[PDB]
Design an enzyme around this catalytic site. Sequence first.
Site, mmCIF file in Angstrom:
data_model
loop_
_atom_site.group_PDB
_atom_site.id
_atom_site.type_symbol
_atom_site.label_atom_id
_atom_site.label_comp_id
_atom_site.label_asym_id
_atom_site.label_seq_id
_atom_site.Cartn_x
_atom_site.Cartn_y
_atom_site.Cartn_z
ATOM 1 N N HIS A 215 1.019 -1.343 0.237
ATOM 2 C CA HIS A 215 -0.077 0.068 0.021
ATOM 3 C C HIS A 215 0.676 0.844 0.092
ATOM 4 C CE1 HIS A 215 -3.835 -1.931 1.030
ATOM 5 N NE2 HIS A 215 -3.263 -2.957 1.506
ATOM 6 N N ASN B 85 -10.033 -2.909 2.067
ATOM 7 C CA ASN B 85 -10.339 -2.805 1.089
ATOM 8 C C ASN B 85 -10.951 -2.944 0.539
ATOM 9 O OD1 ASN B 85 -7.640 -3.488 1.464
ATOM 10 N ND2 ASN B 85 -6.904 -5.649 1.067
ATOM 11 N N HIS C 238 -3.521 0.504 11.783
ATOM 12 C CA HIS C 238 -3.145 -0.463 12.446
ATOM 13 C C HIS C 238 -4.588 -0.824 12.879
ATOM 14 C CE1 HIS C 238 -1.302 -3.461 14.341
ATOM 15 N NE2 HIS C 238 -2.033 -3.561 14.962
ATOM 16 N N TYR D 196 1.575 -4.711 12.168
ATOM 17 C CA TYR D 196 1.496 -3.112 11.780
ATOM 18 C C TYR D 196 1.704 -2.216 13.064
ATOM 19 C CZ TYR D 196 -2.319 -3.971 8.417
ATOM 20 O OH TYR D 196 -3.094 -4.563 7.008
#
Lengths: 726, 726
Positions: free
Chosen positions: A101, A174, A365, A388
């Site tokens: 990303h 997503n 995260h 994360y």
Amino acid sequence: SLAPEDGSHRPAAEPTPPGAQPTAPGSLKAPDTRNEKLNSLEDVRKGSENYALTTNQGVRIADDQNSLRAGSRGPTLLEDFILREKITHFDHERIPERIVHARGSAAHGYFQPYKSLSDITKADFLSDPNKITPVFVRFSTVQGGAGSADTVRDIRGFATKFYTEEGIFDLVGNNTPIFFIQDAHKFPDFVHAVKPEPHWAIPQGQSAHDTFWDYVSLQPETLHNVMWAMSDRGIPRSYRTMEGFGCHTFRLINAEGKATFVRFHWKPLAGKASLVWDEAQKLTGRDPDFHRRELWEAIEAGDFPEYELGFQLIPEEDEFKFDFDLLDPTKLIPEELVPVQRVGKMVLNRNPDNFFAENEQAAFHPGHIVPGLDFTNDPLLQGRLFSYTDTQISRLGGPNFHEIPINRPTAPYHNFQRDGMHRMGIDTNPANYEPNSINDNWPRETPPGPKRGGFESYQERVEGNKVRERSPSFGEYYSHPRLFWLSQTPFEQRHIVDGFSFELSKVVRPYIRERVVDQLAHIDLTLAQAVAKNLGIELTDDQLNITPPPDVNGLKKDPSLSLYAIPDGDVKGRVVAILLNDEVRSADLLAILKALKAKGVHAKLLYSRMGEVTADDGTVLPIAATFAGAPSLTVDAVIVPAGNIADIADNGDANYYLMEAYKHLKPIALAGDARKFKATIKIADQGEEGIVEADSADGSFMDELLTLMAAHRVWSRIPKIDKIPA
Amino acid sequence: SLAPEDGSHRPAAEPTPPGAQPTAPGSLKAPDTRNEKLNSLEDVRKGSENYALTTNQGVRIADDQNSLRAGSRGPTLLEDFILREKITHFDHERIPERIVHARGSAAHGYFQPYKSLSDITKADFLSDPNKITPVFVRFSTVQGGAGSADTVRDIRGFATKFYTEEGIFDLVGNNTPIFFIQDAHKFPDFVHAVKPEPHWAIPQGQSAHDTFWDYVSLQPETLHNVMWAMSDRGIPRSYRTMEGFGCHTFRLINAEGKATFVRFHWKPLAGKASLVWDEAQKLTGRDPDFHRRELWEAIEAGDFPEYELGFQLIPEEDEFKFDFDLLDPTKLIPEELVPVQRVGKMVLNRNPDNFFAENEQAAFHPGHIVPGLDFTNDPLLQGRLFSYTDTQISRLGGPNFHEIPINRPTAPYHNFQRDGMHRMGIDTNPANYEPNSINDNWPRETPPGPKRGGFESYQERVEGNKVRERSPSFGEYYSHPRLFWLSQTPFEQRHIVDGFSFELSKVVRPYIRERVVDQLAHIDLTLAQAVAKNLGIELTDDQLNITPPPDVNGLKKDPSLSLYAIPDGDVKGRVVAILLNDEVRSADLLAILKALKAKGVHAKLLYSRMGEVTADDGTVLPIAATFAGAPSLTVDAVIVPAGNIADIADNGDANYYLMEAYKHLKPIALAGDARKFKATIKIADQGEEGIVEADSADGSFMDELLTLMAAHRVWSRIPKIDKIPA
Ligand code: HDE
Ligand code: HDD
Ligand SMILES: [S]
Ligand SMILES: [S]
């Protein structure tokens, strides 16, 4: 003074349509927009007007054009600290980009729930319809670097940082409802496979290479998300026109301690819309910043991106009621089986000031949850939990990444942690440990409770041996890909076929293409044969006789899985190219612009050169771009008003503009002698659906054109395009 | 076992043409290509076949598909150290990219001089034609990130690390002979102006935005390099087909200590070639990895990139003999005034094994010189010397970056420096200081000498006051832009006009465009009028009357500044697209491939699907790509053989292929019934220069085609392409 005398260097600080003004930092463009988070960043915002140029130590610089040397043609001296400070800062500007990303675009906004959800969750941000929660949202691709192209075929990320009064909650989603793999241990394998290959670091922003398709062919669990990626879902028109999903089953936890399973949805209020592949790919070349630019210009125009948050809710005692495992992140929950319940509205209404400081340094995260939420045993989510936090220690330089301004909670934060690189907060607590008496044990733990309580995990039952073992319940790979496929329209199916076909043609080792075709034949024979034909592969008799997978809990399709099966178009914030000539008919142009304005549709006036032209009645028309400068790829439809058509009739660029638009299924509208251009796209004298035409640009000429834009693209034109050389 | 039975997963370890095999790490593709540096990396190469999959600590893994969990649907356990180690390494893969030149592609090779240069330099690597010096070369763009596109309009870097017996010498050059700015202190200003703008981080890979043109308009010293960037120099066909330059006056020093001024040149033995703007831009979308791919595949094929190193030499007593200052890096030395002496040849013959380990971690820096070379007071070079050491502390993590394998000298290195992050060398010296008695003062200083001596600076006299002041002799900005302009062919001039016109049209603030046009009027009126015309600007009376700048030392042009004025084409390593049909005349294809092989020209057989077609005589012809999968952008020429032309005659994609190649000035060849295609590109029955046509692909047909290819593009076609809609 270097600024022009007329002040035309400064963008108007008011909403203006794309192209009308230069773009500007958010706090300058829209100073009157605010929220709690934007307010709290004021202490670090740095202005500029009327200040002296200094070192970082606050020393005024007299000459910022030259190094210090021994005579004006002499060597540069080591004592020039002003030079070394400036070059040192430049030398160290870059930080590691995100592992995945890396490419993304972000904006501030706010969220509010439609009603209190206190019956199902004690999460404070959802407890009161008057409670407004600031957000910061980053959209992204997955594969490519921070300097890669926006309109690639890839999954998209959609991450929302909620600055709640009980902590940061990050919803890190997503634009598809599932993922490629089941267990987090395989994430570096999958990501390595899709990323550029390690010998030569090719290809950028693309899954169309050997290692990706090798991995897929050897891991059928990936097929479900691969179907999505090969569909037009993989190439959205805008971040404003894609769905968002939370990927996993999480839990809501109410005041009573009741757990409800939840999956998160974002619904785009601008509707769902995607590009077509030839367009998307050429667009990565014509404007690799298209989605970043479109998001920023939407917000500067007041076309604020809006999304409705929604929950699919499943009671605990319904865990095993489906054909698939709720914890399996390669499985979607069909909306036909569990409806999305609307929860609230998010509006993105301010751009950042500094892209690096706010966008590149933001850290999202999914383990950042708040009381009233909790996790589940989804084994992909489970491993995300580690990643994360860990990845920030190199990316953002250490464990104080929460003190970077964009990442700061607006909620209070106090604890006994100390030090670390870049430590900002200066702790006055006599104690850095608990329990302590020397500060009467503050800051103090807080028991869980209905509001403002400490976080306690839901006491889920755990039973089994310590195993590295996939649940047998995850061992089914084809039925969801098949439900997806069957839920697509005939033109959406065509585009899926062409997606796999194009990507597999870029795989150099033929056996890998054959292996993938074999996987497709376990999904749907029609799909499989269609891809095979494009690859010159013939299915065996055994492949022809593979039994299709079972339906999913009795469903043989679910139209919510289609981009287009159920119209949800909205033309506000779309854009039309207007092809000008040296003597436009003003009555056509007035009518066109009046109709577009009234629906919130933008326009760009194009010609063969920059400057202005003059209409028949003497109106001076400013040109925005040349045909070549602002290609049809960047717009949603094309209108050609009447007038001196001869001026552009033999212009290669103007003709090709209509061909490229026609090929990409865009609406096209031609007034009077602009009907001459019908010849270049081979339209019959009787006309065809998707081409609007008339003597003049009204009565119903604009209503027709706008009806067509509401339906996004002219899918019926698909048979006609293959014959046009464009 | 997962590999295919037939072994078709592994590429042959022999040179193969582009597309014939999957590409591979260099040590597997070409195991027998060796040099002292490639051999010295063997201690760190790691293989894989027949080895067990392990942790980094050497523990064998049994199950690399699952996390450890309590029950097979249970939570992941913190004691799963195999998962955390794997995810930790992944989470920390990325390091900061280069501040500039982040996008680049690299290869191993060797250099060897044509004769001893001991009369002018004591540099050991230039002392004997027998001295073979390993090199590692990285080619780059400047502005875009590591994941940006290759064929952007930009300057290109050309950096060569020479692993000499007397130390690393890095020659860190670019593809134009000058730079945009005079003094290093302004480097961050210029680079921030060219880079994506800070509010929204747009645009990637492009100078076509307000801030760059704002700076240029305010800083006329930039105009010379801007002329280069706006020319077709800014869009090279290949790293193999561009010139390189050392940018600055350096010194050679000989054994007697005489200093000679030197500028460095690399001359491409494959000739000079660039794209055209539309083709480059579109190529950034169709294949953003085009130059990286083309370099790697050239080396795999045996088309090794070759460059001749060249020196322009100026005696120290000639320092002031020109009408520009030798220390001004915005001034070039015309080859008509100081010719380039050809000194040696560099050949790139092996690709890396791992792009990140060898390419991304490579550190080049122009202060890395050896005895026999020295600096000058060029105020840009002067500040560079600070930056290339300093930037590696964050980029490569600390001061031991010379221990990263690719960076290591092959020459011995011993000194008293210790520690630092990730220290590899374990020093056994009892002393970490000198002078010392405890190790008899080893390692010891070495006096300067004719060979194997220590480094001593040339004792240049320095006289002047400590000042931050630009030399008055640098204060001339227009004569070199004009020399460059007047040295270009009329089609190279048209492309320069187009480049300015296209970029300035993308500048939203009109006064910036106006101010740039005023600067152009100081260079050449015809240029300024042509740009102004495209922007709808009219020159004022004063602008029409600005006196041109003087000639450069009597010169009113120098053809060495043109890409194309003096013929220099080499067809070896170029590629042709051959558009198949379902029944090709085999006799055409035999001759075509025959004649292309004899000149080292490659081919790609293209069709409407993958698989094979079968020729008229039953010959089976494998298809490399579809027409849409490998566009004419990617080839140098297009051939259409005879056969069943009806099969493709009405294929939009096939027709477009020839239109796009036509528009981009490429040679097209058509045999028998392929001449039916003349109608799509508007070719008169009588034919046209640059279209080869005959009854069949006989001998004369291929000669004429190969002649056109030696001349690169068909410039005479330019006035015909305006009307073609492509
Ligand atoms: C469901 C939506 C989703 C899923 C399933 C995953 N990602 Fe993401 N990701 C990181 C790791 C990671 C793991 C370990 C897994 C499954 C095991 C996923 N991903 C799948 C990361 C490497 O830690 C990451 C990179 C840098 C960072 O800070 O986190 C990361 C990025 C990421 C983003 C970008 C956030 C942003 O800054 O915009 C998004 C939206 C996702 N992941 C979603 C996601
Ligand atoms: C004072 C700052 C400064 C100045 C004025 C210049 N450079 Fe530079 N250059 C850097 C500071 C820098 C750098 C920031 O230090 C880089 C980026 C990161 C790196 O390792 O070095 C770099 C990288 C870099 C590279 C890429 C090396 C690689 O491939 O890894 C090349 C080819 C050049 N430069 C060439 C030039 C040329 C031809 C210049 C003008 C003639 C020039 N630089 C001026
Ligand atoms: S997911
Ligand atoms: S330079």
